[PDB]
Amino acid sequence: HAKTVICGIINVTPFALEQALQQARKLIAEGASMLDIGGESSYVEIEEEIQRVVPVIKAIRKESDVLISIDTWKSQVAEAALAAGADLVNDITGLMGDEKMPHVVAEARAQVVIMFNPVMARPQHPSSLIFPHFGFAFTELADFETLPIEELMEAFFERALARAAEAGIAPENILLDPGIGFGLTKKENLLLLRDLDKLHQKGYPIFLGVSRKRFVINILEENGFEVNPETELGFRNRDTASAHVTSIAARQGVEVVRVHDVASHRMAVEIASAIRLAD
């Protein structure tokens, strides 16, 4: 198959535009084949987010054919964003945050990432508590609280794929994301990573968030590596750590990774693929 695509993260901060246009150039030049544009943080939020991501999207589109993803769970944002050059929606609520999202994706003929969101699925699980609240969903949710992570993931996905099926999004336009880092424990995070092929067995490409996740940070810390992001040493170790997950991921054929440091992950992707595609 084709080697792992690197998706570089561009978070527009609430000039902000010239700064996002600058990061894009940088990531492209580092070998990003896709960029993920986010503008998060009511009609007031929908409008402010749109006025964040839309100008950025247009400007990238003026100079580049790079695949652009809109990181939004709000259908009004993804709609403005596709109308401007975006190719796909990265939905961190996996179609559960907005009932009209499926239609917006279906209507635009777009690709979509359906992330498993365990924070929505288990709002009171101790790991979820620190997370904000996603969505404008689930019933009396009482089974969820209790399921193993992989049966849990499955149930969320069952729901969300049905939502997509009814909107008529072509099955070949869907990418699944296990939701690593989101109200999952260390062990659940690692188990889901250990079992990426089970998720491949379902038949969809896998979009993976491998970058600067607290569980990898803590493996570094417990093991004598400096992890303070405000040091050169700590900053680099954190990005190298992630590149290692990309190495493992790209080797088993994960289709996309979503990442901060494109260059360290391009080194992982090249080594892992050369091995994978040996013959």
Binding-site residues sit at: 11, 71, 90, 177, 213, 258-260
Site string for ligand PMM, 93-132 (x = CB under 6 A): --------------------x-x-----------------
Residue 261 found at the interface with ligand PMM (CB under 6 A): no
Residue 209 found at the interface with ligand PMM (CB under 6 A): yes
Give the one residue of 7, 34, 77, 92 binding ligand PMM; rule: CB under 6 A: 92
Task: Provide, rounded to whole angstroms, the least separation between the CB of residue 40 and ligand PMM.
Answer: 8
Task: Provide, rounded to whole angstroms, the least separation between the CB of residue 94 and ligand PMM.
Answer: 9
- DSSP conformation letters of the chain: ----EEEEEEE----HHHHHHHHHHHHHHHT-SEEEEE----HHHHHHHHHHHHHHHHHHHHH---EEEEE-S-HHHHHHHHTTT--EEEETTTT-S-TTHHHHHHHHT-EEEEE--HHHH-TTSTTTTTS----------TTGGGS-HHHHHHHHHHHHHHHHHHHT--GGGEEEE--TTSS--HHHHHHHHHTHHHHHTTTS-BEEE-SS-HHHHHHHHHTT----TTSHHHHHHHHHHHHHHHHHHHHTT-SEEEES-HHHHHHHHHHHHHHHT--
Of the pair 181, 279, the CB lying nearest ligand PMM is at: 181
Give the one residue of 71, 79, 188, 261 binding ligand PMM; rule: CB under 6 A: 71
Give the one residue of 5, 20, 38, 255 binding ligand PMM; rule: CB under 6 A: 38
Residue 23 found at the interface with ligand PMM (CB under 6 A): no
Site string for ligand PMM, 3-22 (x = CB under 6 A): ------x-x-----------
